[PDB]
Every structure is written in structure tokens, then in C-alpha cells.
């Protein structure tokens, strides 16, 4: 983990060392050009967390009577809901761990009693459904039913504001991939043909780094488990 300022220094003394958006001392990016990097940086982090299952985070959802669709939005969180239009929040989080709507793909759902709940099983009456990728639907809200949703999560969105996040938590082996994508976005913005050729090199380099990580499995992406169907099938 490191501050976004270190990212600015690394870009200043890295791929963007010969650009006009760096300071005279090569210590930081130009202040007016900082939001350009921030937008690209968030985009790059989203792609990395999609190809690689690096972060697995879980959330707690409380079933409310008379409600079937449960969007996973921060406006329904207890720490961020507005009482004027929301009767009561159903997403529970902590003051220092506010929900940031980092949901990418739902993996599994367990209720408060410890039973696995099938998802998108059309032939199963008790199964849950997801009409939208970030919306959870329950067709039978009970009295004290509480659901826990474990999902693949993206990195929290960076922001230059003081209250916003200002740290990066990614495997250090993917740092060249992050720099390459940011460099690709910058050089692609310039429409000069010379910059276009340079932009493609970084994008190709970024893809090469990603496949190298997959080839050696440096992020423990591959997962195996002991066989259980042998007992269930009754082979004995």
C-alpha cells in the first residue's frame, strides 16, 4: 500500500518522464492535469480487478417487509442514507468501512442460519434472482431473514479530495501493468501519428504483463478443493 502521491512520483519518474505535464523537478504531475490521471487510474484498476479475482469482499443485507428488490447502493447504507426519503436502511456497514458500491459480480449468498442460497436457479422456487448485476431480488422476505452476500469487489475509487480514498492496495507485481495502461491512455489522447505508435506499445506491454502473471499464477488465482461428489454420489 502507498499514497497516490507516490503514484504521481512514480509516473513522473517513469513512463511520463518526457512529458509536458510533469513539474520542472520531475517530482509531481501538474496540478491542473491531475484529474486526467485520476480518471485513467480508476479505469485501469477496474480492468485489473476484473481479469484477476484479487479482492473478495462481503456485505450484509437485512430483509425488509414489503420489499423484494434490494439495490446495492450507498444511499441504502446505514452510514449514508438520507432519512428524508428512506424510511430505514437495509445495508449494514461501519463508520470507518462505509459501503462504496464496489460490487462487480456476486459469488455466493448465505443466510443468517448458515444455509447456502442458490442464485439464478429458475426451476428452484426458493432460489434468489438478480435482474441487474448490482441488484439483489428476494421473492419471499421473512421476519428475521438476514442475508450475507460475498462478491468480487473492485478497488475503491480514488479521489484527490481529503475525505476520499488516497491509497492503492494492489499486488506490487502488477504495478508495471498499471503504469502501462495509464501511459496508453495518455499517448492515445494525443492525435499525432508518432504518439499513436508509442501508445500501442504500452497497451501491448500491458497485455503481456497480465498474461505473464496468469502463466505463473502469482496472484493465487487458481483454486482447488477436496472432492465431495464421491460421497454424495454414493460410490463409497
Amino acid at each position: 500500500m502507498y499514497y497516490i502521491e507516490e503514484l504521481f512520483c512514480r509516473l513522473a519518474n517513469g513512463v511520463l518522464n518526457n512529458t509536458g505535464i510533469v513539474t520542472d523537478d520531475r517530482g509531481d504531475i501538474e496540478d491542473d492535469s491531475k484529474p486526467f490521471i485520476i480518471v485513467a487510474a480508476n479505469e485501469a484498476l477496474t480492468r485489473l480487478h476484473g481479469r484477476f479475482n484479487m479482492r473478495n469482499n462481503n456485505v450484509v443485507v437485512e430483509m425488509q417487509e414489503g420489499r423484494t428488490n434490494y439495490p446495492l447502493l450507498a444511499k441504502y447504507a446505514v452510514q449514508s442514507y438520507d432519512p428524508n426519503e428512506v424510511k430505514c436502511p437495509f445495508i449494514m456497514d461501519l463508520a470507518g468501512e462505509k459501503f462504496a458500491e464496489d460490487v462487480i459480480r456476486i459469488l455466493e449468498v448465505y443466510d443468517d442460519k448458515g444455509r447456502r442460497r442458490p442464485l439464478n436457479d429458475r426451476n428452484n422456487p426458493c432460489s434468489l434472482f438478480t435482474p441487474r448485476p448490482n441488484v439483489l431480488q428476494n421473492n419471499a422476505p421473512k421476519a428475521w431473514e438476514v442475508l450475507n452476500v460475498m462478491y468480487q469487489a473492485k478497488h475503491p475509487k480514488l479521489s484527490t479530495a481529503e475525505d476520499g480514498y488516497n491509497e492503492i492496495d494492489i499486488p506490487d507485481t502488477l504495478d508495471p501493468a498499471l503504469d502501462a495502461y495509464i501511459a496508453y491512455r495518455y499517448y492515445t489522447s494525443l492525435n499525432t501519428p508518432e504518439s499513436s505508435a508509442k501508445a500501442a506499445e504500452y497497451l501491448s506491454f500491458y497485455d503481456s504483463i497480465c498474461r505473464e502473471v496468469v502463466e505463473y499464477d502469482l496472484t493465487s488465482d487458481t483454486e482447488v478443493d477436496t472432492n465431495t461428489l464421491f460421497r454424495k454420489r454414493g460410490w463409497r
Binding site: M1, Y2, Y3, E5, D24, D25, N57, L94, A95, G96, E97, E162, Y165, N166, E167, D169
Partner: protein, 59 residues
């Protein structure tokens, strides 16, 4: 560094901030920066642009 030798490391403590309650999943860095600002020399390779006008033959 190794202040752990002196003890007083019991987890049961009364100090707690309700505004920063968090689980073990949340990890963040503090806002403290610029610890020392070490002494250093200027760089003559770059010439900084003049920002003020001085009258000639100023006393």
C-alpha cells in the same frame, strides 16, 4: 523499534473512537507526511523563471 519488550500490550483497553469503527478488512494510511524535509542543495541544471522586476542601479 522494539518497545514491545516493555510490555503494556494488552488488547483490553478503554480508548475507542466510534467515528472510526472498522473491521479487520479495512486498511488505510494516515495523513501524516513531510516528516523531515532534509537539507539539500539547489539544482543549477534548471533555471527558474524570474517573477519580479528590479530597478537598475538600485541603491
Amino acid at each position: 523499534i522494539e518497545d514491545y519488550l516493555k510490555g503494556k500490550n494488552c488488547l483490553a483497553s478503554p480508548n475507542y473512537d466510534p467515528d472510526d469503527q472498522h473491521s479487520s478488512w479495512r486498511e488505510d494510511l494516515p495523513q501524516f507526511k513531510k516528516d523531515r524535509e532534509h537539507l539539500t542543495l539547489v539544482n543549477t541544471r534548471r533555471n527558474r523563471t524570474y517573477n519580479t522586476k528590479l530597478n537598475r542601479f538600485d541603491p
